């Protein structure tokens, strides 16, 4: 055998740079990124980047050759090519002034289904259910954003439908576990088939687009997530026996009935079972209906919050009347007036809280995180030296890598955070007394 040349095997063969992957696949940078979104293809760093880059030291991103080799035989890439042919045929038809041919082209516009992409990305429904938290967070984020040029109006409608169908399933199966009102939004936490599903739902407010994000990238993610949730929701409804998709009540949807439009016709989960809650016109109905109905509680709301209100403000069957407004001119009786934090603490702790302590115009006891687990010593709101010095001063270098160095991070942040909040209790007690 001749002298084997350098850089012909090993890391230099296993890894491929982004620009070489572009030339290998004959794709544009945007097209290569899109299939990496649709499939799972992400950069990888070799241990020896200089060796993996044929001796070069220039900054470079690497992929597996086997990952790019898998993209060679991917049917959707031809759909991207078929779209470019389409896009040019439409331009010629519009350039030559043929409106009816262009309309026929637009009707027959090439499409693709992520059927095979979902299956090969997630072999099992358990694998899918694990990686749903990002899908739900993105879908719920876009179900409230205004329609713009970058994002499809029908795409927005798909987000609203898929999010509502998922919420309906969790309500029906009573899979909700925890609900956390953070400054970011409402962190929900359900368990489906043993998997812990946590997603955040933002508040409905008239924000502005940041104008610094690339909605092209978030368009591909949204397209993939909509396909994933459609197939996930289809199985979940079939497992429960419900037909998918649930029928649409267009009039009620146009009357802002929300979840009431979506009829779920068949084809401590009882914490609020014996309670008829009522919602005033100052509270997040989109969140309060979900949490209460997830535990069996009946919910009525102000008509301005939406149509389909089973109850009414005059109906005395109301037991609790959520009203975050600091004033009620319509103060009833037997309808104990509380605030939403009373509700959300009830789901998180699974125990009815103090109505008076959460009554109108209260001090609002602190909101706990149902996700934060108590640390070794972190404060939950609800002779020796001559031996220790040697014990910590010998192996400070009597080793080789001195991997003991991670105490300098681990013990620091843990202890100072413990010392800081163990000090806050001391300060707050002093202020009280």
């Amino acid at each position: 055998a001749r002298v084997k040349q350098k850089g012909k095997a090993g890391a230099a063969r296993i890894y491929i740079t982004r620009n070489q992957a572009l030339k290998k696949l004959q794709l544009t940078l945007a097209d290569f990124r899109r299939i990496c979104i649709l499939k799972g293809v992400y950069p990888r760093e070799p241990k020896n980047k200089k060796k993996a880059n044929k001796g070069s030291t220039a900054p470079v991103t690497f992929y597996y050759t086997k990952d790019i080799q898998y993209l060679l035989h991917e049917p959707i890439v031809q759909k991207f090519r078929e779209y470019k042919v389409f896009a040019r045929k439409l331009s010629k038809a519009l350039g030559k002034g043929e409106l009816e041919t262009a309309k026929r082209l637009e009707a027959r516009k090439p499409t693709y289904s992520l059927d095979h992409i979902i299956k090969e990305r997630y072999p099992t429904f358990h694998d899918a259910l694990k990686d749903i938290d990002d899908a739900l967070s993105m879908l719920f984020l876009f179900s409230t954003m205004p329609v713009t040029d970058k994002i499809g109006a029908a795409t927005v409608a798909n987000c609203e439908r898929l999010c509502a169908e998922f919420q309906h399933y969790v309500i029906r199966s009573n899979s909700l576990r925890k609900a956390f009102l953070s400054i970011k939004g409402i962190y929900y936490q359900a368990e489906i088939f043993g998997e812990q599903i946590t997603w955040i739902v933002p508040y409905k407010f008239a924000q502005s687009v940041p104008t610094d994000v690339d909605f092209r990238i978030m368009h591909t993610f949204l397209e993939f997530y909509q396909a994933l949730m459609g197939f996930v929701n289809f199985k979940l409804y079939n497992t429960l026996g419900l037909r998918y998709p649930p029928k649409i009540d267009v009039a009620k949807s146009e009357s802002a009935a929300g979840l009431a439009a979506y009829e779920l016709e068949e084809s401590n989960t009882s914490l609020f079972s014996n309670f008829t809650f009522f919602l005033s016109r100052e509270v997040p109905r989109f969140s309060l209906e979900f949490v209460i109905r997830a535990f069996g509680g009946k919910v009525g709301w102000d008509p301005i919050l939406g149509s389909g209100s089973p109850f009414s403000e005059s109906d005395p069957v109301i037991t609790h009347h959520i009203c975050d407004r600091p004033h009620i001119s319509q103060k009833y009786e037997g309808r104990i007036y509380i605030q939403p934090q009373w509700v959300y603490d009830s789901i998180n702790k699974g125990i009815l809280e103090r109505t008076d302590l959460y009554a109108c115009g209260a001090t609002l006891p602190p909101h706990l995180s149902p996700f934060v687990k108590v640390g070794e010593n972190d404060y939950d709101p609800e002779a020796e030296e001559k031996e220790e010095k040697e014990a910590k001063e010998l192996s400070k270098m009597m080793m080789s890598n001195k991997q003991r160095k991670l105490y300098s991070k681990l013990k620091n942040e843990n202890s100072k955070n413990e010392n800081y909040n163990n000090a806050l209790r001391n300060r707050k007690r002093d202020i009280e007394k």
């Binding site: 400054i183 939004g185 690339d214 605030q339 001559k386 040697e390 009597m398």
Partner: protein, 396 residues
Amino acid sequence: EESYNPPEEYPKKYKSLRVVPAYSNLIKEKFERCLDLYLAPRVRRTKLNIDPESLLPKLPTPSELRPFPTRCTNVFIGHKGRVRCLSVHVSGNWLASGGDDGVLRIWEVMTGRCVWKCSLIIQSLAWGPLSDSPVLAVAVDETVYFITPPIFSDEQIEASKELFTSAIWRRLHGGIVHATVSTPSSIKSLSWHRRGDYLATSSPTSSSQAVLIHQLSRGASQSPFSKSKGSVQAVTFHPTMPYLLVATQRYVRIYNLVKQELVKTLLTGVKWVSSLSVHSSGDHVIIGSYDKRLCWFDLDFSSKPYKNLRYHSRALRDVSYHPSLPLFCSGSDDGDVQVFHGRVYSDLLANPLIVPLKILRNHKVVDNVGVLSTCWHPKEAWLFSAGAGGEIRMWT
């Protein structure tokens, strides 16, 4: 656990849910999450299953082995400049120290008295090995004086004289000078042979004659090196058999004077070697280095250092091994002296046990200079530390 009304820290506190604004950055965070899912390189590690870093260290049992020099109690003061070098007589009662002031002070260890104030820059000073001949060889520039203070008994002065009574030889408040030796270069380090007949002088500036061997019985000097290569930092004699150790800038070379040959070359792996010390067993060498590194060499283990130690924040100045007790010390410009327990077994399979014992502090730093020289008391675990402030510390 940061929300409308959190007690954990004070983000922001909101009196009511209605007042809670819209998080403007939520779109940006989800965008960055999407960016990470396809642009962030992913590496799969072992997660280093929960394992507090304190499991990794070994057990010293320092209490079980406690000849530790505790905080200093005897303070010798009076020297107005940096004490360049100091040494303790074989008896251990007299401490001869000298510095840039040119003042030679002989101190009584048990009392701290300066009985010999007579001065007569002091590069270094080393006592003779023979108790009956208490002669102190003191180097100033290129001149070395063999001083026998009249503090010793008269017969001991005579027992010093008859030992002797390249480098040229020549034969005051008790200025008992015996044989002045002048050399081409400024002598830096002094070493005494075990029998006292040979004195080794090392100078870094010189090349051909950097190291000189002086035979007192013949009253002559010569260069044992036919051709010397590299600068010489320090010189010492092997404590068991006739070898001469040359600590060069980068190496440590063992020279057999009887056969006039080379025995071993130790690669310190260090940019600059400061000083060397030899265990009385003769098979262990400790190298103090300007690279803030202490290298332990086992002559029977490897040419490479057996251990590397880098506690010091500044260049390591001197390293001294206690002649009897299994303890050694390192002094650096940081002002801190490190006392280590180094215990040696004669068994081949038995690796010598080296552990730290103490980090002696509270020493002054002058002109970015801290501890210059350290000496071990011949009897017990007492350390003589010479600082740049003119202070001598008794670490008992």
